[PDB]
Symmetry: C3
Subunit: 494 residues, 3 copies
């Protein structure tokens, strides 16, 4: 069924931040499968325990963007998440109108892997045909962005999108009001904001933005939405300015607004992709597939020169993720002579740009890591940099490389891994079991605070220790106990 | 013979604007062959009829350049053209000194197809060797342009070029005076200007500019002429400024002048082609021929990315016809998977740039045009745009595609095709025979004016209707009758 | 042995300016082998003759850089050079500490060909791995240059580097003091400067700069030296400014200084090579080797378009030797159809850029030089340009092409070859033997001056005439006689 596929997707696949489909933002050690929908029903049914704080906090995760900026992905506390996912499942026949929207490019969809939200998933041919087809006969292309979107979505506006603003205000139960309550329970009983990364917040965002899409559609606008980005194709500048006005009205009705540093009108014909994308692909040494693998295999100077050219292009343009695109272009066709050179270049690029650390997972088997302890000092210097810059995805990926490849990790860099206080980093140090006593000091400092929001901020670490019998639950409810009795592990093996 | 080849070329091949050798400016439905030299002799011999207006007007044709600018090509009225071509033929032993000029790159020449004027015809190897050989040892490259050339060539200066200015002024018969008269009869008995596109005006321009070439040659200048463009190679800046001075004097003697927005001195070594040409060819995915066709066949992403890069390069440089060069680079090596994608990209580019419409004639058989009437609305939206922008070559090419592929054409776009009043468009609508009555209203409005110049502006439409027996001749002379009796058709089949 | 290999290298291989390893700065007609170490010992042992001038002058050679700037390479007078080379040989166990330095990239080393100093010699893979390895984890890259280095190295500071500044000042014999004296005797008994091109001056420069390298090393700086260029990799800007301060102190202690027009701090990650290098290599049509030679063979338009793109890139960037790199990329894979076109393009580029003349030695066999005397006028027009611009390497290479290919050379260009007064040019005219009498006038004007420094400036011409029995020695010492008796020829055959 599609209800069952959504129920699997909300918990087994898209609970953790898993929207990016090329490389994940979270290392593959952390997996949310075995958190089955029946365990979510049992958690929702459980009513024990008393909480002194309204709502639940989230395990935080600062992922690095192309400009090294942090984006705070969140792992919802699972007692607050099981109710939210179960509510979205039970109400799916009244929610699936977001699937029938045609202006939302990334939306819930029955993906084969098990997910429902995968950004940048559709193939290049259809994307090109759509871009030309919608750019047919038009003069201007308007790009608009919602300012926060994740930051300031109003949860009380979830019924406003569903049955209208004034009908919902008069009505103040209906399914969308309980959805608003359950979404609020996900993040500290707070009206504004949604945790970034779970598909439940993507569904909540799609529900609110589908009314905006409906009103923009009914006024005859050619437009597409990519999460919070609206692209409009306009025969004249009348359409260009009036779409911006109508989008501003429709967002302001649901308390949202437009990012005016991201608004720009560009005369068609522009570029189907961004300009740096075609600059890289035109100069890519892999741009032609030769149908024989020896020809497809690249040389040392070819890959290195393309990587230098990508570095200059990112310094000179910087409009997008130039390094990640360029590295994905050359990463899978490396010859054995290249692997050490491109590996060290990736070490250089991963230090300077910590979002490039996941690509280091491709080469680690082919590179002989023992060497003369060069890579040993490299990964620790990266770990120190990720501790310094407060970057969670680079820290977690580097620690996944350190435990998976058994490379030792220094004490002084751990002094800042423990002091940074990223939860997912501390779960990796927790799964190592060598640093049991520095982990114990941190969790004891959390418990001695007697602040439930800090325990909810480190719920993944606390649950991993409780499931590994190294600690008891810090909660008086049965949620951790129902998780552990059924075998829920958020750091599972194969 | 060469006299006979010129006589064929003036009427069968280069009567209509046919100078461009890669893609024609006029669709292949309009062909000037079967207008044989014997029919031209019979037209010249005929002396019947009375005309109230001095001279004849021309069928006008606004072709689109690389910057979307119109250039008004002209189809000379054939009673005024037969006399001109016959006069140039009879006097060819006194005209062929323009063929012996060595500084005129495009000039009358015995081409194999049947033409005598083909711009951009010589191969790249000789052009490169000439450019290096003439750039041997020199410091500066001067580029100069005649301002109007076609716009303000003085017809009375045709004998001035032939026998000298003062000798011709004292002489005021010689063959060049009758050539001046016959050239004036081509365009409304007007002294200034030549109809752009016939080879007779190219011969007239070469006759006048050969004296300029002779004087510049005798003063020891290394220079080449491309229609109205002079390139000079200079050992110092003394040569650079003095060539500009002498060219200004020699043009001002024959009443011409220099385009001073097109004058520029560039220090050698510059670029053999223009800079965007090498930028495209260096980045072209077809730049290396592999001697096997599967390797020569291109992929989807390769062609699309090169086309986006060409769009950015034209937006960023714009110095030449970047899109046409880039499309000619990739057009003939398309794989079957590409054809729909590159076709839609060409639809996007043809709408924005109407000179790119002729390339749509390459792909139309390989594209299944029935579809879901998408291409049906595309070609009509292009037709509306060409009606709006007053672009004749895009209109004529799109109509040639519409009749040849049998795709239907809307009434409201025809409301502006009839209102634009391009003659060659109305001959396509005339050959369709569905819109017989809107054509009849236009020609009746022309005839009711009783202005012979408007009848001469639509002589091709009037002759096509008269030859198809749908209308009588609007002329009291026998020229149309001698044309029709011998079977002259300007819209012939095979 | 390594002492013997150095002794061979100082005289047989690196006496003449031979540091560049791709194409030499001096044509292959001039070779310093057969000037064996035993002849150097016999010259050093000889004590006859009286000289009225202190020291010896050098045969001068203005080589053209990438910006057409002259660099004055010098061929040391061999009586002053044999003593210097023999002194460096005898003291090699006290000099070889410059070989153990790890921050000097170009230094004495046992090369296979016979040299000890070859700049730009190490392979690209190690250079890339070193550049990434030293750029590991750092924020800034400091580039610094010694201002003159060759121009103002203080010879009295040779013992200052060897045993310390104050110890050497108090000591005022030790081996480094006699090295300072012998280095002074090389150039006119002058304290400042070293003749550029002999390896003895490279050894003298390495001796002085190794103390700077030692002090910079002991203060924990990651830095590399390329002759006179220091590159430093810095974790912060504290290291960046403090390295510049310490390098300025260490150079000022040995009387040197920093080129402050060549000092710049660039945030890593920059470019491993320069930016134009990756721009050329990414756009190079030879960037992928196909393992079959027909595929590796290039077409006409491909090479010509890459050469035009290189010309624009050098006009637009100009940061390095863009033309020489681009030509070396395509020079060895030319197809037979290309050779004439790329040859004429190289003629164009050699005229405008005289450092590109040596590449003309690759193509001269494949090009049929007889033709219609086109290349005959080309090489003479180049010879006139090299005479005009006072460029010695272009003159010498063009004359090597003229004598080797037997192409005639005009009298009026020889009027300026004789008037320029480059010594190596006059040795080529001397070896031709046709122009025996214009050579005789020049050497008689030199001898009538009775200035020993001019005779030392043309010692190579004087020795070549004396060894060819066309003239007697202009020296009262036996050095020329011991050279000729053992068969020393500086223009030898095979």
């Amino acid at each position: 069924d599609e209800k069952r596929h959504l129920y699997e997707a909300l918990l087994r696949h898209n609970y953790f931040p898993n929207q990016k489909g090329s490389i994940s933002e979270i290392p593959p050690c952390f997996s949310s499968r075995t958190f089955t929908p029946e365990i979510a029903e049992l958690i929702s049914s459980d009513t024990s325990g008393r909480r002194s704080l309204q709502g639940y906090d989230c395990v935080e995760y600062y992922a690095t963007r192309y400009n090294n900026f942090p984006r705070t992905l969140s792992i919802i506390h699972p007692k607050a998440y099981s109710k939210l996912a179960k509510h979205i499942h039970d109400n799916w026949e009244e929610i699936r109108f977001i699937k029938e929207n045609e202006n939302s490019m990334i939306k819930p969809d029955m993906h084969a892997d098990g997910r429902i939200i995968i950004m940048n998933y559709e193939d290049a041919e259809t994307k090109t045909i759509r871009e030309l087809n919608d750019g047919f006969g038009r003069r201007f292309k308007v790009n608009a962005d919602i300012s926060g979107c994740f930051t300031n979505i109003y949860s009380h506006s979830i019924p406003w999108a569903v049955i209208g603003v004034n009908n919902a205000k008069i009505a103040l139960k209906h399914w969308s009001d309980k959805l608003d309550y359950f979404q609020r329970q996900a993040k500290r009983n707070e009206t504004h904001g949604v945790p970034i990364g779970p598909a439940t917040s993507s569904i909540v965002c799609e529900i609110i933005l589908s009314a905006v899409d409906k009103r923009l559609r009914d006024d005859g606008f050619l437009f597409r939405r990519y999460i919070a980005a609206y692209t409009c194709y306009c025969k004249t500048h009348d359409d260009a300015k009036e779409f911006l006005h109508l989008l501003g009205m429709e967002l302001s009705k649901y308390k949202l607004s437009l990012n005016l540093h991201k608004t720009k009108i560009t005369n068609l014909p522009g570029t189907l992709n961004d300009n740096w994308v075609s600059l890289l692909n035109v100069n890519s040494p892999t741009k032609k597939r030769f149908t024989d693998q020896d020809l497809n295999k690249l040389s040392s100077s070819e890959v290195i020169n393309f990587l230098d050219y990508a570095v200059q292009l990112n310094t000179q343009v910087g409009g997008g993720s130039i390094l990640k695109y360029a590295i994905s272009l050359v990463i899978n066709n490396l010859d054995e002579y290249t692997i050490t050179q491109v590996y060290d270049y990736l070490l250089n690029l991963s230090w300077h740009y910590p979002m490039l650390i996941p690509y280091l997972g491709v080469l680690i088997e082919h590179v002989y890591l023992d060497d003369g302890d060069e890579y040993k000092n490299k990964f620790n210097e990266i770990l120190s940099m990720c501790a310094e810059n407060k970057c969670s995805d680079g820290m977690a990926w580097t620690l996944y490389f350190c435990i998976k490849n058994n490379i030792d990790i220094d004490d002084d860099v751990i002094e800042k891994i423990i002091c940074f206080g990223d939860c997912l980093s501390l779960c990796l140090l927790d799964s190592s079991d060598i640093y049991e006593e520095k982990i114990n000091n941190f969790v004891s400092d959390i418990i001695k605070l007697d602040y439930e929001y800090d325990i909810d901020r480190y719920w993944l670490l606390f649950y991993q220790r409780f499931f590994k019998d190294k600690a008891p639950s810090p909660y008086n409810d049965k949620c951790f106990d129902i998780m552990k009795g059924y075998g829920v592990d958020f750091m599972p093996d194969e």
